[PDB]
Amino acid sequence: DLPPIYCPLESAIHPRVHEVEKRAVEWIRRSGMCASEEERAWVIATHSADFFARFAPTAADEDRLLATSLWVYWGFAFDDHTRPAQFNALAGRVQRALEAPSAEDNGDRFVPALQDIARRFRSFGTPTQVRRFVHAHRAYLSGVAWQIGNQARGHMPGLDDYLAMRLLSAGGEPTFAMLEIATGAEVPDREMHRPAVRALTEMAIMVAALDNDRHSLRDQNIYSVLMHHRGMSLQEAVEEATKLRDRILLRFLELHDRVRPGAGAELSTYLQGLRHGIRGNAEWGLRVPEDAPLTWAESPSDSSPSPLPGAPSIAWWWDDALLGA
Amino acid sequence: DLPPIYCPLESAIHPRVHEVEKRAVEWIRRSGMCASEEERAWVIATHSADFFARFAPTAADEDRLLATSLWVYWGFAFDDHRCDNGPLSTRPAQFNALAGRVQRALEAPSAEDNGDRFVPALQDIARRFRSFGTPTQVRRFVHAHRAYLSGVAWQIGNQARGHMPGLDDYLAMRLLSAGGEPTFAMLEIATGAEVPDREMHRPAVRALTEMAIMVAALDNDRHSLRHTDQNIYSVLMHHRGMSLQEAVEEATKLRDRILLRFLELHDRVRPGAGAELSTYLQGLRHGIRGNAEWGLRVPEDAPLTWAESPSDSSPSPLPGAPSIAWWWDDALLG
């Protein structure tokens, strides 16, 4: 019993989505990241071009939209897999290959593909935009390492730890750090790293992450964490999860409205990218198994302007004294 | 049987080191990082203020040299109690969770410690870094910090499996696990010189940072030689069937080659550098030298000897380490 999603945000998709999808399907087939035709079909069936065309709907350069979409395909293909000890090494190697073009594949299937993506990013993006994506990619790999860690030990994390980890393990950091690369609109340091923008970025990531949890009811996820800790039933957890998520999005809209008016063209595009991304991520979740009409919740299920109790690690999102920008 | 260190770089130490060491000893006592009197005295005996006062010897504000110095103390304590000998040293699953929690505590001032002694200490250091560094410098430190932790996770993974990495994985891993990224990312905070994104992130500058880090990491491995530990020596003894004495000569050759390429690239990049990049590059240089000099002095006033010449002066990439070959590629580092 799944309530409709609260997402009063702009929905749009690149007009050239289908041309990019074609080129991306080509690159998947040639990438070497897939053993069998059955594995390609699985990665092709993620419709990651359709996903990311919703994040950068007006990207001037079709090739930047392709490069950024390819990573999303790479991410789905990488996460369809490993013990923590081998993973920590593999995470280290893959991330080195992202940062070091002279790194060699050593027969690892994912490294050439990521290095082809990195080479496309280095031919378009500034060294600054590449370093942002690089750091986001390591943050994601740390999240995955954390989640594989918990599973191998049978640690079910409490809410604060789950939300912190899922911030990273969902792949939201690298996805949102590709907005600039797709658009070409370079956000200056003093704007991109304002705490206020950091909280907007994390809050957009968290809501996309909790919406991915919801699209997965069909084993570390907000529902398990709430059931295991708060002794809730599935329904009671579904209802509590929707309240957490809707409260976070409410904070996002509020902080966004405080921040958007003073913003430069580049930060402004980035912020419309967060919004497009949150909505795109929800809409892609509903439309992926395409053209049927979607139903959306008109109101938050919880309107509280105060921080989530039991999640101190995300409380600073609500602390305007800390975010004076 | 160890040859002297090739290190023809500026030795200098902050004229206020002794005052800063005093306030840092005070902070280590009320820090909470340390269970016993015995640990406190260990942390203190790292002389981390002397170490980092070599990295930023003209720091205008000793509060900034202090804050940065604190992380170096936190660093030794974190390695010694969580990474090298802690029940976590062979438990990557548990270490992966700790690294997530410690990193989150550094990015999120509202995070709670969950009874981990190292977190409130880190959060205090973070609060200082935020009080006078720009949010850009704080993020460069925070990113460098997760990089360091990823390296330790890789190291601890290898220890659990009894896996001795090869030269390529070892140099890539050690680039991170030896804590040089966050060490060097504190130069800006210590000095107040905000290096613009366009300059800091130039591949040439990134390569100098990595080479400054590799060299300091291999001087650390040299410092730790005075079988099963992952270091350049067991790496070479295992993968290339060498005696310890052959590994030692081999390690010295590779390290000196990297230092020469650092020196060559430094000389091509320094002339055009703006004032903030120039300060950062003097830091890399002061750091390399500071790391080695601190390592021969840490039990310290006696005359040291240095190698007048490198052990190998080949101007091309290390054999068997393609992950660093791009440091020699002047086209990619335009």
Author numbering:
A (entry chain B): 7 to 87, 96 to 232, 241 to 311, 324 to 359
B (entry chain A): 7 to 232, 239 to 311, 324 to 358
Manuscript excerpt for this entry:
To this aim, a small library of 24 variants of SvS-A2 was rationally designed, based on the SvS-A2 crystal structure targeting the active site as well as surrounding residues. The variants could be grouped into four categories based on their substrate preference in a Malachite Green assay: promiscuous (I), inactive (II), diterpene-specific (III), or sesquiterpene-specific (IV). One representative variant of each group was subjected to crystal structure analysis, and Cα rmsd values in the range of 0.35–0.68 Å compared to the parental SvS-A2 structure indicated that none of the variants had significant conformational rearrangements. Therefore, the altered substrate preferences are likely the consequence of steric and/or electronic interactions with substrates, intermediates and/or products, as discussed for the individual variants below. Furthermore, the studied variants were dimeric in the crystal structure and maintained a substantially elevated melting temperature similar to that of SvS-A2. A Trp156Tyr exchange (Group III) results in a highly active and diterpene specific SvS-A2 variant. The variant’s specificity for the formation of the diterpene spiroviolene over the formation of sesquiterpenes hedycaryol and farnesol can be expressed as the ratio of apparent second order rate constants and increases ca. 2.3-fold from 38.4 ± 13.7 in SvS-A2 to 88.1 ± 29.8 in the Trp156Tyr variant of SvS-A2. The exchanged position is located directly opposite of Trp79 and the introduction of Tyr may allow for additional cation-π interactions in 2, while yielding sufficient space to accommodate the bulky diterpene intermediate between Trp79 and Trp82. The Trp156Tyr exchange slightly reduces the melting temperature of SvS-A2 (from 71.3 ± 0.0 °C to 67.7 ± 0.1 °C) and more so of SvS-WT (from 58.2 ± 0.1 °C to 45.2 ± 0.3 °C).
Spiroviolene synthase (SvS) from Streptomyces violens was first described by Rabe et al. and represents a bacterial class I diterpene cyclase that we were not able to produce in sufficient quantities for crystallization due to protein instability. Terpene cyclases such as SvS form a variety of complex multicyclic compounds with potent biological activities via carbocationic, electrophilic cyclization cascades of relatively simple substrates, either by metal-ion assisted release of an allylic pyrophosphate (class I mechanism) or by protonation of an oxirane/ene-functionality (class II mechanism). We previously reported a hypothetical ancestor of SvS—SvS-A2 26—which shares 77% sequence identity with the extant enzyme.
